[PDB]
Nucleic acid binder design. Sequence first.
RNA 1: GGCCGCAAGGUUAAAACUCAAAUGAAUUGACGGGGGCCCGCACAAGCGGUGGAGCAUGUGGUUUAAUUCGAUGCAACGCGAAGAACCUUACCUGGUCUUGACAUCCACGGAAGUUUUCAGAGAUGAGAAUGUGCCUUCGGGAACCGUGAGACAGGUGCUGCAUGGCUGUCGUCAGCUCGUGUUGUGAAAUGUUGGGUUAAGUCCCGCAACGAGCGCAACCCUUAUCCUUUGUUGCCAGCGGUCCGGCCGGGAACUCAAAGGAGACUGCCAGUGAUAAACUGGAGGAAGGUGGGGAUGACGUCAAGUCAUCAUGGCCCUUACGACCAGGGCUACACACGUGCUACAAUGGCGCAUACAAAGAGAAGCGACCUCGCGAGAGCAAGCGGACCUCAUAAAGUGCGUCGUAGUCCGGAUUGGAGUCUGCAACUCGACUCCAUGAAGUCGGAAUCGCUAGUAAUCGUGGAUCAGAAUGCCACGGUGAAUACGU
Lengths: 50, 100, 206, 151
Amino acid sequence: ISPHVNKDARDQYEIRTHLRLVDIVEPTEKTVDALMRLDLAAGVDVQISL
Amino acid sequence: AKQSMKAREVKRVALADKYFAKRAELKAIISDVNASDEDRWNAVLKLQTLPRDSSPSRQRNRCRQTGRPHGFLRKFGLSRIKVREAAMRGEIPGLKKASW
Amino acid sequence: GQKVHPNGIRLGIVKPWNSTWFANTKEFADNLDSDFKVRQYLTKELAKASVSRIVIERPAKSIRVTIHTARPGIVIGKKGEDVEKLRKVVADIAGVPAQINIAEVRKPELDAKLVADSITSQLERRVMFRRAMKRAVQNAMRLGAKGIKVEVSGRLGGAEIARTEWYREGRVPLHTLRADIDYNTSEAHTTYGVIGVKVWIFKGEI
Amino acid sequence: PRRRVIGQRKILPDPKFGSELLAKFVNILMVDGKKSTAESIVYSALETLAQRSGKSELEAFEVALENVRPTVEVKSRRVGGSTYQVPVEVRPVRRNALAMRWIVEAARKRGDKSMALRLANELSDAAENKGTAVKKREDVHRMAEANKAFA
RNA sequence: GGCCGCAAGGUUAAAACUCAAAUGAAUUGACGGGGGCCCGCACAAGCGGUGGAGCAUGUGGUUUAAUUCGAUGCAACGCGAAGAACCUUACCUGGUCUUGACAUCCACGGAAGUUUUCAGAGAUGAGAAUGUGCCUUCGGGAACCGUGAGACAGGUGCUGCAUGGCUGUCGUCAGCUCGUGUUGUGAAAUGUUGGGUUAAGUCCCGCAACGAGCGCAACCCUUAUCCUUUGUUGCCAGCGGUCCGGCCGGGAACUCAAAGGAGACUGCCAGUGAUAAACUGGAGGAAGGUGGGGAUGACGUCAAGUCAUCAUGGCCCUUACGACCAGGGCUACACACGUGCUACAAUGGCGCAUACAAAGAGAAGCGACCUCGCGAGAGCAAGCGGACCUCAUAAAGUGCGUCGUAGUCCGGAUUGGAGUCUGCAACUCGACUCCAUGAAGUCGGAAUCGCUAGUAAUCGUGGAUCAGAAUGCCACGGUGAAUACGU
C-alpha cells in the first residue's frame, strides 16, 4: 500500500461467489418455453442443462 | 513508462499473432520421433530465420493504465496501486476488505 | 497517522457499489478496461453539466449506463439531439448495444463531489480560499446536514511553503460504521502548482 | 506480573499408574512435542529400576526424590551498588520442580549407551546418596549456610 | 597622585577603547545523577536461538568499458524486486535515421497473402499473384500502406528544501480542543483539578462553572452451542438384494453444505462499600464478567520516504540528454556487517509395512488407466469450466531387524564423467537425474534476540509472480510443553 519501500503495511481483499442448483423432474413444452422466455437481474449467471 | 516501450509491446503481440501456425508446424516436425533425420535439420535451421519478436516468451505483462513492469495481477489487468485505487472508489464488483 | 477511505470501509454495510455484474476470469480484465474508457469519455464530454456519479450495468449482452446530474436539461438537449449522440459513441466504445438513463440531483449543496468541484473552480479564478470554504460549510448546514468537514492543501495564495487547513461543523463520526458518510475529492491546477481538496458530509445513522 | 492472578492448569494423571507427579516428570523430560518417546523412556527406566531394589516403582521414585529436594536457597539483591546473597525458604511445589530438573540434567550428561540406562543409573545413585544431583543440593545448602548473616 | 599601616593591604577615585543591549517579577512548556501514584515479555521465574562451520540472499568497499537507479540509528540492509539467460533494461562497446518508434493537421498515389538475394541485425534491392467494400448526381477515400514541409512530437534529464496523491513512526498510548460565563493591567487560568473506581478523560460523588466536539466503548468479519427450511455431485440407523463396495432398491434420521432465528446483560444469590459507582465469591449454562482472534490509527512530531507507478510549477536537450539493432554488464572478489537454511548424532542413521488432516488451483489449463526407461522423463490417450474429474501418496507416529560411541553405516561443500526438459537460443549465467569423489563441524569469546496457551518448539501441505527458474513472502492443519513468589 505504499509507492516505495515499506514492506509490511499490506491490504487484504476477498471476492465471494454464491451458487445454487434447481432440478425439474417432469417438464412439458409450455413450461420449457416459459423458462426460456424469462429475464432476470443484471448480476446473476444462469446455466440450463437438458 | 516511456511512450516507446508500449509501442514495443504492441509490435510484439502483432507479430506473435501473425506467425502462430507456421511455428507450431515446424516445432511438431522437430519434436516428432521417427523422422527422416534431414527434415529435422531443415526444420531446425528454418525456425531461426523467422523474426525474433514472434516468440510468445519475449512479451512482458504491463499495467493497462500506466505501463508498470512490476506488481502485476492477472485477474484485473492492473498493478497493485491502481487496483487499490479502483477498489476503494467502488469500481471492482464484489471486492471488499477481508478479515477472518 | 493515516486514515482509511470512508466509502471503502463502508461498502457492503451502508454503501452500494458503482458497478454491478458477474464475469469469469477470461472477461474480468476486458470488462474493467471498457468501463474505464467509457467513464473517461463521458467525464470529458459533460464537463459543464454537473455530473456526480456514473453507474454501469452489463445485462445479457448489452450495456446500460445511468448518469446522476444536477442539470439534466443540458444533457438531454432539444428532443434528444445530444443523448442520441452519446449513445452512439458509447456503443462504439463498448462493442455491444447501449442504453443511457438520466437521473436528477435535487440538492447540489449536499453532494460531496459537486461541492469539491465548485471550490476548485473558484480557486482557479483567484478567489480567497477562506471565503470559499466558509461559504461551503454554511450552505451545507443551512439546507439540513447533521455535519460537514472541508480540507484544503498546497501552496495557498502563492506562498513558497505549502500548508493545510480545515473547517468543521456539527458531528462527523468516522469510526461508526452504521453512519451515512459521503466523501470525495478534487484537484485544482494553478500557476504555482496543484492544490487538493477533500469534503465530508454526514446525514444520519441507519 | 504486575496486576494479575493466574490460576492453576489441570494435568491428567499417568495412564499406567495414576500419579500426577509422574506426568509432570514426563513433561519435564519431553522435547519438541514428542510425548510417546518420553513415556517409553520413563517406563523402561522404572521397569529396569524396580528390580535393582525390590520395591514398587513409585516407592523407588519417592525415595530418590527425598534426597534431592532442597530447603533453602539464595536470591540476589542490589540496592546499594553491591550484590548480596540473601537466603530464603523454598516452598513445596518448587522443591519438587527443582528436584526433577536437576535429575534430568544430570542424566543427560552421563556417558552410557541408552537414555533409559542413564536415567536408571542416575536414579539408583540418588537413592544411594551419590551423584551430581546430590552434589548440587549440597552446594546450594553450603552457599545458604555461608550467608546466614544477611537473613 | 595624596593620606594611613611593621607588613598584608585599606580609603579617596578617572580616561582611551568596545557592544546594542545588560537587568527585575511573573506565564506556558521541556528537562533533573528532585518527590509521590500507576502501566507494558521492561525486569525477575523459564524454554529455544543468533555471535564459531559450510551454503542462500541483501548492503559497504575495491575492481571493471559498464559493474543502471533508489532506501541509511530505533523507523535502511530476503527493502521498491509478487521472480535480470535474449526480452524485462533505464548501463557499456560498435552499426544506423531525422516531422521522427508514439499523435492532430495539409496534398501527391495506392492496400495483405509467398519467395529470392547482400547484411550480426537494423535496413537495402529483384520478383510473382490480387483489384475490396461504396450516393459514384463521378466530388466518397471514411478503413490503411507509402513521401514532402512545418506548427509540433519525445525525455526513467535536475530540484521530495516549490507540490497533489499515497506510506512509516511515537502509539491502540488515552489523550487533544472549543462556545458562553467568571478571575487577572497582561501573557494566561478555570472547566480537564479533588475523594473513590475501571482496560479506558470508564463511571459516581464533590466543586465558579454550565454545555459540546474529535478520540475510548458499541453497530462490522470470523470462531465455540442449539432449531427450522432444502437434500445433489454430499450423508447411511432402521428395512432388503449380494459378485463385499453406499455397490443396488430405497430413507430424510445423523455428519455436512448455507439462508432466517435464539443466546451472555453484573441478568440472579450472599458478603464489603459513602443509604453510591464498583469489588470478591457462588448457582445454572457450550460459553462469565472485553469468552478467543481480526478490521478499525485523534490534534500533531521527524523541511522523515517517494519528480523512477502516476500527476504537476520552474529550469534544461532538440541531425540529440530523443529512435532501432547484435554482442556484453547488473551474477566481478584481498576484505567488513544484517537476515536465513542444513548440521555437528543414539529422544538417532539405514531397510522392510501400516493409522490419522486442513485449506487451495485448473482451457495456449490440470493430465488419470496402460506400455517403455535404474531414474529425471517419453508414447498413446479418458475426465473436467468442477461438493462429480485432475493436481494428490501427508509427514512426524506405530511394529519388526541392524548399526554400537567411531570424524562413524553421523554430515553432504566441492569436483570428474554421462543425461532429461522449458525455450529461436542454456559459454559467460537455468532447474532436475544417474555413477563416482566425500571438505569444514564433536554445541560455538566479549555481546545479543523471540515467546504467557492450542503460545514456544518440532512435522508435513497450498497459492501469487511465472515459458523455465524459492532455503524468500502470503496462507493451512498434526503432535504439544516449562514458568510467573514479586516490582
